[PDB]
Structures are given as structure tokens and as C-alpha cells.
Amino acid sequence: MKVVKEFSVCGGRLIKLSHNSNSTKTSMNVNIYLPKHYYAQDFPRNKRIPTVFYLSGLTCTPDNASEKAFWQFQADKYGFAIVFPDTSPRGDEVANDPEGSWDFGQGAGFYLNATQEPYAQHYQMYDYIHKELPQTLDSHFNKLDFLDNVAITGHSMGGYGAICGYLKGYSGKRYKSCSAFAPIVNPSNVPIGQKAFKGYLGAQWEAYDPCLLIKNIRHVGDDRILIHVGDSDPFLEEHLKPELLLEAVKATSWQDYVEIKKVHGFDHSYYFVSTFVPEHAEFHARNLGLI
Amino acid sequence: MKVVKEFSVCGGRLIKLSHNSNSTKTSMNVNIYLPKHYYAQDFPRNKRIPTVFYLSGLTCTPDNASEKAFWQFQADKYGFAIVFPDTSPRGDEVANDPEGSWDFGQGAGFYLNATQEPYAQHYQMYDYIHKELPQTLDSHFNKLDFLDNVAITGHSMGGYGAICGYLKGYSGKRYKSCSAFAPIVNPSNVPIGQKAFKGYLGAQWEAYDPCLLIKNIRHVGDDRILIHVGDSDPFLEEHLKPELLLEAVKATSWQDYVEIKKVHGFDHSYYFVSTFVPEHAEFHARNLGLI
């Protein structure tokens, strides 16, 4: 893992890293913010700094959310690290949308393990995020926990990947906390999701659809999914349709445990995301035992 | 004044405006964030929401600082509005750097009233910021004060314009508060400043140089200039040289009232700026009588 660039921000440091990925077979870019706690003189030996993984939306790189969501202030506030993965494999060797669009191909992996050629070669974003990356960060830094006491969140395509990873890992307690911002919640039933699934996967889709996954996953204790979405989000009725997760949990053990806050006047933008980052941070902090 | 685009952010609203400018003779773009106080049901008739004007650096538009500094949270915290002007006149009719560079011409007005053709035609950024814009916002919105109880701040070229406006307006109490982030402080003695001055102005420079202005301006009461600058700022030794303002006030009524916080490890970037926005906000809030 190479340090490409470091920025002091708040009391910690935002680090731009790269590494040769075994899942993607390409160089991958990742950012991590390390909180003030990591640089502090007295950090207790019987504590670990837990990690939040923030998954970005379509066309994004790690830098968009790093610059525009202000997680760094929350990170110092509660004592967690936050990791910002990229959104697809990238490179001259990596397949693109044959239609030359932005909703598929590069910047648009949909957090899936692709089975269809030519994408299967590089598009192993599910193993990348849940299997390789935490271990890679662990080998490089190890104060920090990338593997155990970990939260997952993200925006749009990323809230989708977040919810999806949380649910598929739920019996193993893979993630201790799950939130999302304007997620795509039922990919199988929405145009954007169907193109990603047809393209990357070619019945294989069910394993990647939160609305189908959640129904037979036995809810435990007080666990819940925090969602925010703006009612002025221009993608809301065609792509996101959050109401669909609500409907999916009716008469199900998850029924009272998916909280969608639909927030009047708000967008899809990082103006929206930055506004709800404080609440999501405190939600993740409590689930991580920081407060 | 036209509303081009509105975004809910925090409890207020970020508004992208445009207007036909009489100072520049061109369309100008401006952003303003209005705090939660402005939309609130009970806002007292014997109060006005005071305004912070944030001046941006070279190549910037209003949107950079709007997206990347998170003033909006401070604005709701203390009860001020924040205005983000543009950095030059813009348009197909507006003169550029004959050298095709970014440090002069468009995005690079240096908050000056240009006297030299072809720039004089549009480059009236000093009257634009201090004379036209506050009155224009006043006519459009009038809860709000754009004219009287007003603070000025900004980054690099903008901290320069901020300091410069504050000092030239100081006997008239034009601005009630002045801070800056990584300002250029002695334009007459630094390469970037000399090119702007030679280009826009052609003795005419003194009137626009904070290090020359401050020495005979009689300091009153407890007033002070707040500056932050990072010691890893790559422009620090060639262009910014903050130490120069310090030297300028030695044996002067301003001597103990220019506070430069040189902050270890920090950049020129909005990672730096966003880190010190909370402190600057509380400093401006107190000078504005909000706290």
C-alpha cells in the first residue's frame, strides 16, 4: 500500500492511498481519515479505534465525499476512523459501458461480484470491499480495528452497497452498524439496477437485492437501518424508491426496524449528505460503543 | 437579481443568484446561505441577521467554498448569513491574461478597481464587493443586514481582499470584523501581487497594500485581525509571507492586534480552511454581537 498524499484536517489526517488489488487485479485508490485519537499521546492499550466504511455513489472517486461530507469533524468528535473506497476497478485494461454512459462500467461497479465477461475480469467489488480492503488496511496500519467493530454507510449506489453488505453479513455480525443516504433499495425493480444486474450478472440477482434479502433474515435485539432521503431528490421516484424497503419488511421480523427519514426540500447532493452526516455519525458511534 | 438554483443545507438554504452588475457591466454569480433563523416562525422584530462576506481565492467560483468550507453549520450555530461573491467579471467580452495564466485575468480580479485598459472596462471588483453587491442583496431580500453589522473574511487572494477592505474602511467602521485564511499580505513585494498591480493598476499600489495601509491607521479599542496559515502551504514562502504584516505593525498602534496563527502541518486547501472555519465563525459571531 502506497501513501500517495496526506492532508491535515481537523486534529487527524486524511490519507490518499493506493494499492495493487488482488480482487480487481488493478491499482485501487482509497482514502482514510485517521482521527485525533490516533495521533494522541495517551491512547489506551485496551481500546481500538473502530472504522466506518462510507461507500460512494455513481461516478464518484474517494475524494468527493472526503471533501464534501465533513465526516472528519464527526470522526474527531466520537473517535472513529473513516474509509472511503473507490466505486469500480479503473484502468486502460478495465471494461466500460458499451453504451458510453455513466451508470454502468467505470465509477459504477454497484458493489457486486460480476460473473459475466468482460466485466468478471476486474469487477469483483463485493470481495474488494468486504474481504480484501479491510485486510489490506489492517496489514498496512497494524490502534485501529478494520475487521470487527466496523460500521457501513454510503450514498445512493453506496447506500445500496452498504445495506446489501450489512444484510448478507448480518447472521455473522459482519457489520455492527448500517446507515444510508438516498440509497437505491430494490435494484431488481428499477431501471438502473436492472442494467447493472443484466450487465454484471446476466435468480443471481436475489442474492444482491436488499428487498429480497431482508425478508428471511431474522432480526435480533434492537438493530435498525438508518436511511435519509430528500423529497426533492430528482432520482427518488425513478431509481431510489425507499418506500420499497418499508413494504419489503411488512409482516416480517424487520418490520419496525427500517427507519426511512424522508426529509422535506432536500436533494441528492452533498449539501443533503453533509446535513445528515452528524446524525449518522452519532448513530454509528453508539452502535460502535464510542458513546 | 435571479434565483438560479436553491439547495436546502442544514436548517437554512444555499441560494445561487445572478444579477446584471453595474460595477462589472457583466452578469455576476453570487451564493448566499440563509440560516435557519431566517425561516424561523418567531424571529424578533428588534433583531437583524448580520452578514459574513467570504472572499474566494484564485480561480475559484462561489461554489468551491460553498461546498468545501462548511460555513453553513456555523451560520446556523450563531445566526448569521454568509455571502460568497465571485472572483472577477466573467464573459466572452471580458479581458484575460495575455499570458494565458490563472493568476491574472478571469478568476483573478484581486478585489481591485482596475484603471488600465483593457481591464478597466470590467475589473471594478473593489466597488463590486464593497459598494454594489451589499446594496443589490439588500434590494432583493429587504430580517437581514448586508450593510452595517457585517464581517469580512476569505482565503489567499480573498484574505488579501478581506484585509484590504477592512483596513481602508476602518475609520468609517465599514466592517465590524476581519479574518483571513492564508492571505497574500504584501502584494507590492511578492511576484503574483506585482503582476496584478502592474496589469490592473500600471504609488497607485499603496492604496491597495495592507502592509502599507495599516501603519498610519489608528487602531481602536480591542480590534484585531485573525489570520490562519498552514506551515505546509506550498505558496507560503513565495506569495503569502504573513510574517510581513507582523513586521508592518511593529512600533505601530496595530502592533499587538494582528494575530497570525501559523499551524503546523497544514496546507492551502479547503481541508485547511474547513478546519479553521469553526474558530473564525465564533470570532466573527462575537464581533457581530451574536454571542
Coordinates of C-alpha atoms in Angstrom, one line a residue:
Chain A
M1 CA 0.0 0.0 0.0
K2 CA 1.5 3.4 -1.0
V3 CA 0.8 6.8 0.6
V4 CA 0.0 9.0 -2.4
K5 CA -0.8 12.2 -0.5
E6 CA -1.5 13.3 3.2
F7 CA -3.7 16.3 4.4
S8 CA -4.1 17.5 7.9
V9 CA -7.8 18.1 8.6
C10 CA -9.3 18.7 12.0
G11 CA -6.9 17.0 14.6
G12 CA -6.3 14.0 12.3
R13 CA -5.1 13.3 8.9
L14 CA -6.7 12.5 5.6
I15 CA -4.6 9.9 3.7
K16 CA -4.8 9.1 0.0
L17 CA -3.5 5.6 -0.5
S18 CA -3.2 3.2 -3.5
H19 CA -2.5 -0.5 -3.6
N20 CA -2.4 -3.3 -6.1
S21 CA -5.7 -5.1 -5.6
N22 CA -6.0 -8.9 -5.9
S23 CA -9.8 -8.8 -6.1
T24 CA -9.8 -6.2 -9.0
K25 CA -6.4 -7.1 -10.5
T26 CA -5.9 -3.3 -10.8
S27 CA -4.4 -0.4 -8.8
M28 CA -7.1 0.9 -6.5
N29 CA -7.4 4.3 -4.8
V30 CA -8.6 4.6 -1.2
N31 CA -8.9 7.5 1.3
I32 CA -8.9 7.1 5.0
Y33 CA -9.2 9.7 7.7
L34 CA -7.5 9.0 11.0
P35 CA -8.9 10.8 13.9
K36 CA -7.0 12.9 16.5
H37 CA -7.2 9.8 18.9
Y38 CA -4.7 8.0 16.6
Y39 CA -2.1 10.8 17.0
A40 CA -2.8 11.3 20.7
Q41 CA 0.0 10.6 23.3
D42 CA -2.1 8.6 25.8
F43 CA -4.3 6.3 23.7
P44 CA -5.3 3.3 25.9
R45 CA -3.9 -0.1 25.1
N46 CA -7.3 -1.7 25.9
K47 CA -9.1 0.3 23.2
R48 CA -9.2 0.1 19.3
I49 CA -10.3 3.0 17.1
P50 CA -13.4 1.4 15.2
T51 CA -13.9 2.1 11.5
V52 CA -16.8 3.5 9.4
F53 CA -16.7 2.5 5.7
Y54 CA -18.5 5.1 3.5
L55 CA -19.5 3.8 0.1
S56 CA -19.8 6.5 -2.7
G57 CA -22.3 6.9 -5.4
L58 CA -22.2 6.7 -9.2
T59 CA -19.2 8.4 -10.9
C60 CA -17.6 9.2 -7.6
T61 CA -14.0 8.8 -6.5
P62 CA -12.9 8.7 -2.7
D63 CA -12.2 12.5 -2.8
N64 CA -15.8 13.7 -3.5
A65 CA -17.1 12.5 0.0
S66 CA -13.8 13.2 1.6
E67 CA -14.1 16.9 0.5
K68 CA -17.8 17.5 0.7
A69 CA -19.4 15.5 3.6
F70 CA -17.2 16.7 6.6
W71 CA -17.2 13.3 8.3
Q72 CA -13.7 14.3 9.6
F73 CA -15.3 16.5 12.3
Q74 CA -17.6 13.6 13.5
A75 CA -14.6 11.3 13.4
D76 CA -12.7 13.5 15.9
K77 CA -16.0 14.1 17.8
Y78 CA -16.6 10.4 18.6
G79 CA -13.2 8.6 18.0
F80 CA -13.6 6.6 14.8
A81 CA -11.7 6.3 11.5
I82 CA -13.5 6.6 8.2
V83 CA -12.5 4.8 5.0
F84 CA -13.6 6.0 1.5
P85 CA -13.2 3.2 -1.1
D86 CA -13.5 3.8 -4.9
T87 CA -16.6 2.8 -6.9
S88 CA -15.2 0.3 -9.6
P89 CA -11.9 -1.0 -10.9
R90 CA -10.2 1.6 -13.0
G91 CA -7.6 1.4 -15.8
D92 CA -7.0 1.2 -19.6
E93 CA -7.5 -2.6 -19.2
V94 CA -10.9 -2.4 -17.4
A95 CA -14.2 -2.8 -19.3
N96 CA -16.6 0.1 -19.9
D97 CA -20.2 0.5 -20.6
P98 CA -20.6 -0.4 -24.3
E99 CA -23.3 2.4 -24.4
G100 CA -20.6 5.0 -23.1
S101 CA -22.9 6.0 -20.2
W102 CA -22.0 6.9 -16.5
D103 CA -24.5 4.5 -14.7
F104 CA -22.5 1.3 -15.7
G105 CA -18.9 0.3 -16.0
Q106 CA -16.2 2.5 -14.5
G107 CA -17.3 4.6 -11.5
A108 CA -20.3 2.2 -11.5
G109 CA -19.4 -1.3 -10.0
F110 CA -22.6 -1.5 -7.9
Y111 CA -20.6 -3.3 -5.1
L112 CA -21.2 -6.6 -6.9
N113 CA -19.0 -9.6 -7.9
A114 CA -19.5 -9.7 -11.7
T115 CA -19.8 -13.1 -13.3
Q116 CA -20.2 -12.0 -17.0
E117 CA -17.3 -11.4 -19.3
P118 CA -15.7 -9.0 -20.0
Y119 CA -16.5 -7.5 -16.5
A120 CA -15.8 -10.5 -14.4
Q121 CA -12.0 -9.9 -15.0
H122 CA -12.0 -6.8 -12.8
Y123 CA -15.5 -6.2 -11.3
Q124 CA -15.1 -8.0 -8.0
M125 CA -16.2 -5.0 -5.9
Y126 CA -18.1 -7.1 -3.4
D127 CA -15.0 -9.1 -2.4
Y128 CA -13.0 -6.0 -2.8
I129 CA -15.0 -4.1 -0.1
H130 CA -15.9 -6.8 2.3
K131 CA -12.9 -9.1 2.1
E132 CA -9.7 -7.5 0.6
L133 CA -9.7 -3.9 1.6
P134 CA -10.2 -4.3 5.4
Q135 CA -7.4 -6.8 5.4
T136 CA -5.2 -4.6 3.3
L137 CA -5.7 -1.6 5.6
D138 CA -5.1 -3.9 8.6
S139 CA -1.7 -5.1 7.1
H140 CA -0.6 -1.5 6.4
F141 CA -1.5 0.1 9.7
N142 CA -1.4 -2.7 12.2
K143 CA -4.6 1.2 17.4
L144 CA -7.2 0.5 14.7
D145 CA -10.0 -2.0 14.1
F146 CA -10.9 -2.6 10.3
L147 CA -12.4 -6.0 10.7
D148 CA -14.6 -6.5 13.8
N149 CA -16.1 -3.4 15.3
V150 CA -17.0 -1.8 11.9
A151 CA -19.9 0.3 10.6
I152 CA -21.0 0.6 6.9
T153 CA -22.8 3.5 5.3
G154 CA -22.9 5.3 1.9
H155 CA -24.8 7.4 -0.6
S156 CA -27.2 6.3 -3.5
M157 CA -25.3 3.3 -5.2
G158 CA -23.2 3.3 -1.9
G159 CA -26.2 3.2 0.5
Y160 CA -27.3 0.3 -1.7
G161 CA -23.9 -1.5 -1.2
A162 CA -24.0 -0.6 2.5
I163 CA -27.4 -2.1 3.0
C164 CA -26.5 -5.1 1.0
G165 CA -23.3 -5.8 2.8
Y166 CA -24.9 -5.3 6.2
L167 CA -27.8 -7.8 5.4
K168 CA -25.7 -10.6 3.8
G169 CA -23.3 -10.4 6.7
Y170 CA -26.0 -10.0 9.4
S171 CA -26.1 -13.6 10.8
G172 CA -22.2 -13.4 11.1
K173 CA -22.5 -9.8 12.6
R174 CA -20.1 -8.7 9.8
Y175 CA -21.1 -5.0 10.4
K176 CA -22.1 -3.6 13.8
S177 CA -23.9 -0.6 12.3
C178 CA -25.7 0.2 9.0
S179 CA -27.0 3.6 7.6
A180 CA -27.5 5.1 4.1
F181 CA -28.2 8.3 2.3
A182 CA -30.7 8.2 -0.6
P183 CA -30.0 4.5 -1.4
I184 CA -31.2 2.5 -4.3
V185 CA -33.1 -0.1 -2.4
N186 CA -34.7 -2.6 -4.9
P187 CA -32.2 -2.8 -7.9
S188 CA -34.2 -5.7 -9.5
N189 CA -37.3 -3.4 -10.0
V190 CA -35.6 -0.2 -11.0
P191 CA -34.0 0.6 -14.5
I192 CA -30.5 1.5 -13.3
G193 CA -30.4 -1.7 -11.1
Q194 CA -31.6 -3.9 -13.9
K195 CA -28.9 -2.7 -16.3
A196 CA -26.1 -3.3 -13.7
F197 CA -27.6 -6.8 -12.9
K198 CA -28.1 -7.7 -16.6
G199 CA -24.6 -6.4 -17.4
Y200 CA -22.6 -7.8 -14.5
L201 CA -24.7 -10.8 -13.5
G202 CA -26.6 -11.8 -16.7
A203 CA -32.1 -15.7 -9.8
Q204 CA -28.4 -14.5 -9.5
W205 CA -29.8 -11.0 -8.7
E206 CA -31.7 -12.0 -5.5
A207 CA -28.5 -12.5 -3.6
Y208 CA -27.9 -8.8 -4.2
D209 CA -31.3 -7.3 -3.6
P210 CA -31.9 -5.8 -0.2
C211 CA -35.7 -6.0 -0.5
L212 CA -35.5 -9.8 -1.2
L213 CA -32.6 -10.4 1.2
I214 CA -34.2 -8.9 4.3
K215 CA -37.5 -10.9 4.5
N216 CA -36.0 -14.1 5.8
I217 CA -33.1 -12.6 7.8
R218 CA -34.0 -12.9 11.4
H219 CA -33.8 -9.5 13.1
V220 CA -32.0 -9.5 16.5
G221 CA -32.4 -7.3 19.5
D222 CA -32.8 -3.6 18.8
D223 CA -30.9 -3.4 15.4
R224 CA -32.1 -0.9 12.8
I225 CA -31.3 0.5 9.5
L226 CA -31.0 4.3 9.4
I227 CA -31.9 5.9 6.0
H228 CA -32.2 9.5 5.0
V229 CA -33.6 10.6 1.6
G230 CA -34.7 14.1 0.3
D231 CA -38.1 14.6 -1.2
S232 CA -36.6 16.9 -3.8
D233 CA -34.1 14.2 -4.8
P234 CA -34.6 14.1 -8.6
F235 CA -33.8 10.3 -8.7
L236 CA -36.3 9.5 -6.0
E237 CA -39.3 8.2 -7.9
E238 CA -37.4 6.5 -10.8
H239 CA -34.4 4.9 -9.1
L240 CA -34.4 5.0 -5.3
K241 CA -37.9 4.3 -4.2
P242 CA -37.1 3.9 -0.4
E243 CA -40.7 3.1 0.3
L244 CA -39.9 -0.3 -1.3
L245 CA -37.7 -1.4 1.7
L246 CA -40.6 -0.5 4.0
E247 CA -43.0 -2.5 2.0
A248 CA -40.5 -5.4 2.0
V249 CA -40.4 -5.6 5.8
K250 CA -44.1 -5.6 6.4
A251 CA -45.2 -8.7 8.4
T252 CA -41.5 -9.6 8.7
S253 CA -39.2 -9.6 11.8
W254 CA -37.6 -6.4 10.3
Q255 CA -40.9 -4.6 10.3
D256 CA -40.3 -1.8 12.9
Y257 CA -36.5 -1.5 12.4
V258 CA -36.0 0.1 9.0
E259 CA -36.2 3.9 9.6
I260 CA -36.5 6.0 6.5
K261 CA -36.4 9.7 7.3
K262 CA -37.8 11.4 4.2
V263 CA -36.8 15.0 4.6
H264 CA -38.6 17.8 3.0
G265 CA -36.9 20.1 0.5
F266 CA -33.7 18.1 0.2
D267 CA -31.7 17.0 -2.8
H268 CA -29.4 14.2 -3.8
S269 CA -26.3 16.3 -3.3
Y270 CA -23.6 16.6 -0.7
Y271 CA -25.5 19.5 0.7
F272 CA -28.0 16.9 1.6
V273 CA -25.4 14.3 2.7
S274 CA -23.3 16.9 4.8
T275 CA -26.5 17.9 6.6
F276 CA -27.2 14.4 7.9
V277 CA -23.7 13.2 8.5
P278 CA -23.8 14.5 12.1
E279 CA -26.8 12.3 13.0
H280 CA -25.5 9.3 11.1
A281 CA -22.1 9.7 12.9
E282 CA -23.8 9.7 16.4
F283 CA -26.0 6.7 15.4
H284 CA -22.8 4.8 14.2
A285 CA -20.8 6.0 17.3
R286 CA -23.5 4.5 19.7
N287 CA -23.7 1.2 17.7
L288 CA -19.8 1.1 17.9
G289 CA -19.8 1.7 21.7
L290 CA -18.0 5.0 21.4
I291 CA -20.9 6.7 23.3
Chain B
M1 CA -31.4 39.5 -9.2
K2 CA -32.4 36.0 -10.4
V3 CA -32.5 32.8 -8.3
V4 CA -30.6 30.4 -10.5
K5 CA -30.8 27.4 -8.0
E6 CA -31.7 26.7 -4.3
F7 CA -30.3 23.9 -2.0
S8 CA -31.5 23.0 1.4
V9 CA -28.4 22.7 3.7
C10 CA -28.5 22.4 7.5
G11 CA -31.7 24.3 8.6
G12 CA -31.3 27.1 6.0
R13 CA -30.9 27.4 2.3
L14 CA -28.0 27.9 0.0
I15 CA -29.1 30.1 -2.9
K16 CA -27.3 30.6 -6.3
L17 CA -28.1 34.0 -7.6
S18 CA -27.1 36.0 -10.7
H19 CA -27.6 39.7 -11.5
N20 CA -26.5 42.3 -14.0
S21 CA -23.7 44.2 -12.4
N22 CA -23.3 47.9 -12.9
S23 CA -19.7 47.8 -11.5
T24 CA -18.5 45.0 -13.8
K25 CA -21.0 45.6 -16.6
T26 CA -21.4 41.8 -16.8
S27 CA -23.6 39.1 -15.3
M28 CA -22.2 38.2 -11.9
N29 CA -22.8 34.9 -9.9
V30 CA -23.2 35.0 -6.1
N31 CA -24.1 32.5 -3.5
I32 CA -25.7 33.2 -0.2
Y33 CA -26.5 30.9 2.6
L34 CA -29.5 31.9 4.7
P35 CA -29.5 30.5 8.2
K36 CA -32.4 28.6 10.0
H37 CA -33.1 31.9 11.9
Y38 CA -34.4 33.4 8.5
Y39 CA -37.0 30.7 8.0
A40 CA -38.0 30.6 11.7
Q41 CA -41.6 31.5 12.9
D42 CA -40.7 33.7 15.8
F43 CA -37.7 35.8 14.6
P44 CA -37.7 39.0 16.7
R45 CA -38.5 42.4 15.0
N46 CA -35.8 44.1 17.0
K47 CA -33.0 41.9 15.5
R48 CA -31.3 41.6 12.1
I49 CA -29.4 38.6 10.8
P50 CA -25.8 40.0 10.3
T51 CA -23.8 39.0 7.2
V52 CA -20.3 37.4 6.8
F53 CA -18.8 38.1 3.3
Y54 CA -16.3 35.3 2.4
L55 CA -13.9 36.2 -0.4
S56 CA -12.5 33.3 -2.5
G57 CA -9.0 32.6 -3.8
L58 CA -7.6 32.5 -7.3
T59 CA -9.6 30.5 -10.0
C60 CA -12.5 30.0 -7.6
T61 CA -16.2 30.5 -8.2
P62 CA -18.8 30.9 -5.3
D63 CA -19.4 27.1 -5.3
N64 CA -16.0 26.0 -4.2
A65 CA -16.2 27.5 -0.6
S66 CA -19.9 26.9 -0.5
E67 CA -19.3 23.1 -1.0
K68 CA -16.0 22.6 0.8
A69 CA -15.7 25.0 3.9
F70 CA -19.0 24.0 5.8
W71 CA -19.7 27.6 6.9
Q72 CA -23.4 26.6 6.8
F73 CA -23.2 24.7 10.1
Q74 CA -21.6 27.8 11.8
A75 CA -24.2 30.1 10.3
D76 CA -27.0 28.1 11.9
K77 CA -24.9 27.8 15.1
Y78 CA -24.6 31.6 15.6
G79 CA -27.3 33.1 13.5
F80 CA -25.5 34.8 10.5
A81 CA -25.9 34.8 6.8
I82 CA -22.8 34.2 4.6
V83 CA -22.3 35.6 1.1
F84 CA -19.9 34.1 -1.4
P85 CA -19.0 36.6 -4.3
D86 CA -17.2 35.5 -7.5
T87 CA -13.5 36.4 -8.1
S88 CA -13.5 38.6 -11.3
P89 CA -16.0 39.7 -14.0
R90 CA -16.7 36.8 -16.4
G91 CA -17.8 36.7 -20.0
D92 CA -16.7 36.5 -23.7
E93 CA -16.4 40.3 -23.6
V94 CA -14.1 40.3 -20.5
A95 CA -10.3 40.7 -20.8
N96 CA -8.0 37.8 -20.0
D97 CA -4.3 37.3 -19.1
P98 CA -2.4 37.8 -22.3
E99 CA 0.0 35.2 -21.0
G100 CA -3.0 32.6 -20.7
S101 CA -2.3 32.0 -16.9
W102 CA -4.6 31.5 -14.0
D103 CA -3.1 34.1 -11.6
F104 CA -4.4 37.1 -13.6
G105 CA -7.5 38.0 -15.5
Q106 CA -10.6 35.9 -15.1
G107 CA -10.9 34.2 -11.7
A108 CA -8.2 36.6 -10.6
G109 CA -9.5 40.2 -10.1
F110 CA -7.6 40.7 -6.8
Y111 CA -10.5 42.8 -5.4
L112 CA -9.1 45.9 -7.1
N113 CA -10.6 48.7 -9.2
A114 CA -8.5 48.4 -12.4
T115 CA -7.5 51.6 -14.1
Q116 CA -5.6 50.2 -17.1
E117 CA -7.3 49.2 -20.3
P118 CA -8.4 46.7 -21.4
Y119 CA -9.2 45.6 -17.8
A120 CA -10.8 48.9 -16.5
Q121 CA -13.9 48.1 -18.6
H122 CA -15.0 45.2 -16.3
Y123 CA -12.4 44.9 -13.5
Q124 CA -14.2 47.0 -10.8
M125 CA -14.1 44.3 -8.1
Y126 CA -13.4 46.7 -5.3
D127 CA -16.6 48.7 -5.9
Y128 CA -18.4 45.5 -6.8
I129 CA -17.7 43.9 -3.4
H130 CA -17.8 46.9 -1.0
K131 CA -20.4 49.1 -2.8
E132 CA -22.7 47.3 -5.3
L133 CA -23.2 43.8 -4.0
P134 CA -24.3 44.6 -0.4
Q135 CA -26.9 47.1 -1.9
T136 CA -28.0 44.6 -4.5
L137 CA -28.6 41.9 -1.9
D138 CA -30.3 44.4 0.3
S139 CA -32.8 45.4 -2.6
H140 CA -33.5 41.8 -3.4
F141 CA -34.1 40.5 0.2
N142 CA -35.3 43.6 2.0
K143 CA -34.7 40.2 8.5
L144 CA -31.1 40.7 7.1
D145 CA -28.3 43.3 7.5
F146 CA -25.9 43.5 4.4
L147 CA -24.6 46.9 5.1
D148 CA -23.9 47.8 8.7
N149 CA -23.3 44.9 11.1
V150 CA -21.1 42.9 8.6
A151 CA -17.9 40.8 8.8
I152 CA -15.3 40.2 6.1
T153 CA -13.1 37.1 5.6
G154 CA -11.6 35.0 2.8
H155 CA -8.9 32.7 1.6
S156 CA -5.5 33.6 -0.1
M157 CA -6.4 36.3 -2.8
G158 CA -9.7 36.6 -0.7
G159 CA -7.9 37.0 2.7
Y160 CA -6.0 39.7 0.9
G161 CA -9.3 41.4 -0.3
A162 CA -10.7 40.9 3.2
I163 CA -7.8 42.5 5.0
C164 CA -7.7 45.3 2.4
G165 CA -11.4 46.2 2.6
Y166 CA -11.4 46.1 6.4
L167 CA -8.4 48.5 6.7
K168 CA -9.5 51.0 4.0
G169 CA -13.0 51.1 5.7
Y170 CA -11.7 51.1 9.3
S171 CA -12.1 54.8 10.2
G172 CA -15.7 54.5 8.9
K173 CA -16.2 51.2 10.7
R174 CA -17.2 49.7 7.3
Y175 CA -16.6 46.1 8.6
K176 CA -17.2 45.1 12.2
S177 CA -15.0 42.0 11.9
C178 CA -12.0 40.8 9.8
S179 CA -10.3 37.4 9.5
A180 CA -8.4 35.6 6.7
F181 CA -7.1 32.2 5.7
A182 CA -3.6 32.0 4.1
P183 CA -3.8 35.6 2.8
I184 CA -1.4 37.3 0.5
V185 CA -0.5 40.2 2.8
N186 CA 2.1 42.4 1.0
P187 CA 1.2 42.3 -2.8
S188 CA 3.8 45.1 -3.7
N189 CA 6.6 42.8 -2.7
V190 CA 5.5 39.5 -4.0
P191 CA 5.5 38.2 -7.7
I192 CA 1.8 37.4 -8.0
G193 CA 0.8 40.8 -6.4
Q194 CA 3.2 42.7 -8.7
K195 CA 1.8 41.2 -11.8
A196 CA -1.9 42.1 -10.7
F197 CA -0.8 45.6 -9.7
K198 CA 1.3 46.1 -13.0
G199 CA -1.6 44.7 -15.1
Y200 CA -4.6 46.3 -13.4
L201 CA -3.1 49.4 -12.0
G202 CA 0.0 50.2 -14.1
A203 CA 2.2 54.8 -6.0
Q204 CA -1.4 53.6 -7.1
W205 CA -0.5 50.3 -5.4
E206 CA -0.1 51.7 -1.8
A207 CA -3.8 52.3 -1.6
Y208 CA -4.2 48.5 -2.1
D209 CA -1.4 47.1 0.1
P210 CA -2.3 46.1 3.6
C211 CA 1.3 46.3 4.9
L212 CA 1.4 50.0 3.8
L213 CA -2.2 50.8 4.7
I214 CA -2.1 49.6 8.3
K215 CA 0.8 51.7 9.6
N216 CA -1.0 55.0 9.9
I217 CA -4.5 53.7 10.5
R218 CA -5.2 54.3 14.2
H219 CA -6.2 51.2 16.0
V220 CA -9.3 51.5 18.3
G221 CA -10.2 49.6 21.4
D222 CA -9.7 45.8 21.2
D223 CA -10.0 45.3 17.5
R224 CA -7.8 42.6 15.9
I225 CA -7.2 40.7 12.7
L226 CA -7.5 36.9 12.9
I227 CA -5.2 35.0 10.4
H228 CA -4.6 31.3 10.0
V229 CA -2.0 29.9 7.6
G230 CA -0.5 26.4 7.3
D231 CA 3.2 25.8 7.5
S232 CA 3.0 23.2 4.8
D233 CA 1.2 25.7 2.5
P234 CA 3.2 25.4 -0.8
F235 CA 2.6 29.1 -1.5
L236 CA 3.7 30.3 1.9
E237 CA 7.3 31.5 1.2
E238 CA 6.9 32.8 -2.3
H239 CA 3.5 34.5 -2.2
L240 CA 1.9 34.8 1.2
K241 CA 4.6 35.7 3.6
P242 CA 2.2 36.5 6.6
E243 CA 5.2 37.4 8.7
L244 CA 5.2 40.6 6.6
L245 CA 2.0 42.0 8.2
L246 CA 3.6 41.4 11.7
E247 CA 6.7 43.3 10.7
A248 CA 4.5 46.1 9.2
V249 CA 2.8 46.7 12.6
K250 CA 5.9 46.8 14.7
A251 CA 6.1 50.1 16.7
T252 CA 2.7 50.9 15.4
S253 CA -0.7 51.2 17.1
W254 CA -1.6 47.9 15.4
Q255 CA 1.3 46.1 17.0
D256 CA -0.4 43.6 19.3
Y257 CA -3.6 43.2 17.3
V258 CA -2.6 41.2 14.2
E259 CA -2.9 37.5 15.2
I260 CA -1.3 35.1 12.8
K261 CA -1.8 31.5 13.8
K262 CA 0.8 29.5 11.9
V263 CA -0.5 26.0 12.1
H264 CA 1.8 23.0 11.8
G265 CA 1.3 20.5 9.0
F266 CA -1.5 22.4 7.2
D267 CA -2.0 23.1 3.6
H268 CA -3.5 25.7 1.4
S269 CA -6.5 23.6 0.7
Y270 CA -10.2 23.5 1.9
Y271 CA -9.1 20.8 4.3
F272 CA -7.1 23.5 6.0
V273 CA -9.9 26.1 5.5
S274 CA -12.7 23.8 6.8
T275 CA -10.7 23.1 9.9
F276 CA -10.5 26.7 11.0
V277 CA -13.9 27.8 9.9
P278 CA -15.4 27.0 13.3
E279 CA -12.9 29.3 15.1
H280 CA -13.3 32.1 12.6
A281 CA -17.1 31.7 12.8
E282 CA -17.1 32.2 16.7
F283 CA -14.6 35.1 16.4
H284 CA -17.0 36.8 13.8
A285 CA -20.1 35.9 15.8
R286 CA -18.7 37.7 18.9
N287 CA -17.6 40.8 16.9
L288 CA -21.1 40.8 15.4
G289 CA -22.8 40.6 19.0
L290 CA -24.4 37.2 18.2
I291 CA -22.6 35.8 21.3

